[PDB]
Design a protein around this ligand. Structure first.
Ligand code: GLN
Ligand code: NA
Ligand code: NA
Ligand code: NA
Length: 420
């Protein structure tokens, strides 16, 4: 009955009704009929849902990772983290290879009628791994700009955007330190567990408002971006390539890996995590849907508390299969647009750069375009075409987000069988 699956049905209905309402508003005038004053009010509920989800990201992530790191032996935690990192890297590489292969086979750039250096980007990623200030890292991330002193000198500053990766690393290290302390750190372990439980209560409350926010978010997203026909006619092949790659990875490849390692049915796991998947689609942010990911993984599935609260926060930052797939597809599409020959070395470096820079993605909406330019510059491809990718990034990115969070969930389930 619709008693325990009421949230799943409500969220699916919310997505469908948001698409329908956005299409109806667009057909009735769209932005011109509404205007900015009415558009802001129309899309406000989705922004409210995003704010509610982002408000609890820092305490939930910090407390969950501290508890998970302090709930395991340092050797066992290290082995679990190594297996998680291997799974994340393998899945990201598979997604990148699938995206490159699909783009090469289908050739979305057949119809030709339509920053930051790589080293500095990786140095910024390393700096964000080890934050210089925890309070600053709670709302700021390091980023490198350039000064034409006309040799370009890279100078860095803390820009807006939560440094989730640095908080993750610090929380893991602090949990390990608490475990090594033992009796002295037991009080802190209890404190962080209680804080995480309270944040779980807040997540359970926000989960009921989640359908309305998702509906209004998708409605506003498809209302603001008008001329859907032109978008799907000019970049239709690229959109189809990205969506097909995401669907293949999330419904064929990742479930195949889950079934091969865990003889259980992966689609039951997917049904259990449907609600955070649709939340990821609506919000286009892995971080925002991460609390719902942990909730559904812990309750709807049989994943242990420590495994989930240690793997999902890490995967929400490191494991991004959709981002890597989209970046590889976009790189091959732009190379085909410029009639650039993609040899084996170029394909290999595209795959490597996408896999390495998917970790550096912030997990925020429209976060893949900041990485696509870096990947293009790594292969010396033209960068002026990214504007085309910006035309439909409101949709593809959303799909990417789904894949991203999905992988995380499956990894947790997989690692559950590594513990049992
Ligand atoms: N295109 C992308 O995948 C960027 C990251 C995505 N917005 C996420 O949160 O997972
Ligand atoms: Na991966
Ligand atoms: Na993720
Ligand atoms: Na990332």
């Amino acid at each position: 009955c619709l008693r325990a699956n009421l949230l799943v049905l409500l969220t699916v209905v919310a997505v469908v009704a948001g698409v329908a309402l956005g299409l109806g508003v667009s057909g009735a005038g769209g932005a011109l009929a509404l205007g900015p004053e009415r558009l802001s009010a129309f899309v406000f509920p989705g922004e409210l849902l995003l704010r509610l989800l982002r408000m609890i990201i820092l305490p939930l992530v910090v407390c969950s990772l501290i508890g998970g790191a302090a709930s395991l032996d340092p050797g066992a935690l290290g082995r679990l983290g190594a297996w998680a990192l291997l799974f994340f890297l393998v899945t990201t590489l598979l997604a990148s290879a699938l995206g490159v292969g699909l783009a090469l086979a289908l050739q979305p750039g057949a119809a030709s009628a339509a920053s930051k250096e790589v080293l500095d980007s990786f140095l910024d990623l390393a700096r964000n791994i080890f934050p210089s200030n925890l309070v600053s890292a709670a709302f700021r991330s390091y980023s490198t700009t350039y000064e034409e002193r006309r040799v370009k000198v890279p100078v860095g500053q803390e820009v807006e955007g939560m440094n989730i990766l640095g908080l993750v690393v610090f929380a893991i290290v602090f949990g390990v330190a608490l475990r090594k302390l033992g009796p002295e750190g037991e009080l802190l372990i209890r404190f962080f567990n209680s804080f995480n439980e309270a944040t779980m209560v807040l997540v359970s409350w926000i989960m009921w408002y989640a359908p309305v926010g998702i509906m209004f978010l998708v409605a506003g997203k498809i209302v603001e971006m008008e001329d859907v026909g032109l978008l799907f006619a000019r970049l239709g092949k690229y959109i189809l390539c990205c969506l097909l790659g995401h669907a293949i990875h999330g419904l064929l490849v990742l479930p195949l890996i889950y079934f091969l390692f865990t003889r259980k049915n992966p689609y039951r796991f997917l049904w259990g995590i449907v609600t955070p998947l649709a939340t990821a689609f609506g919000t286009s942010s892995s971080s925002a849907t991460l609390p719902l990911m942990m909730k559904c993984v812990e309750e709807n599935n049989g994943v242990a508390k420590h495994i989930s609260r240690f793997i999902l926060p890490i995967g929400a930052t490191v494991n991004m299969d959709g981002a890597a797939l989209f970046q590889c597809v976009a790189a091959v599409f732009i190379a085909q647009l410029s009639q650039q020959s993609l040899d084996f070395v170029k394909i290999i470096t595209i795959l490597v750069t996408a896999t390495a820079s998917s970790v550096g993605a912030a997990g925020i909406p429209a976060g893949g375009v900041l990485t696509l330019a870096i990947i293009l510059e790594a292969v010396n491809l033209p960068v002026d075409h990214i504007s085309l990718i910006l035309a439909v990034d409101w949709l593809v990115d959303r799909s990417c987000t789904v894949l991203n969070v999905e992988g995380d969930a499956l990894g947790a389930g997989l690692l559950q069988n590594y513990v049992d």
